[PDB]
């Protein structure tokens, strides 16, 4: 928000803690700011309907 990152990405970008092991999805803006490693689980957008 207003070019002020928060969350895990914010913590990584503010030099507070390297690495962000967790459930983080690769995107474009994030990859523009904070670079990722190779994906280890494939995923995407999907819908459940009961």
């Amino acid at each position: 928000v207003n070019n002020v990152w928060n969350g895990m990405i914010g913590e990584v970008v503010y030099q507070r803690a390297v690495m962000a092991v967790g459930s983080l999805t690769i995107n474009e803006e994030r990859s523009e700011v904070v670079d990722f490693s190779v994906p280890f689980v494939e995923t995407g957008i999907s819908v459940m309907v009961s």
Partner: protein, 48 residues
């Protein structure tokens, strides 16, 4: 690894040994192996 080089584009595969020398990009596909065999001929047709 010679003069040709450039920006090789093909159905390559991301491997440790391959990546130790050249560097890849984010994948543009996802795949497995899925062993393939020839389809069985259905002989159950109630002919006899």
């Amino acid at each position: 690894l010679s003069g040709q080089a450039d920006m090789i584009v093909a159905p390559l595969t991301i491997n440790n040994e391959r990546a130790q020398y050249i560097e890849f990009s984010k994948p543009f596909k996802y795949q497995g192996l899925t062993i393939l065999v020839k389809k069985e001929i259905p002989r159950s047709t109630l002919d006899s």
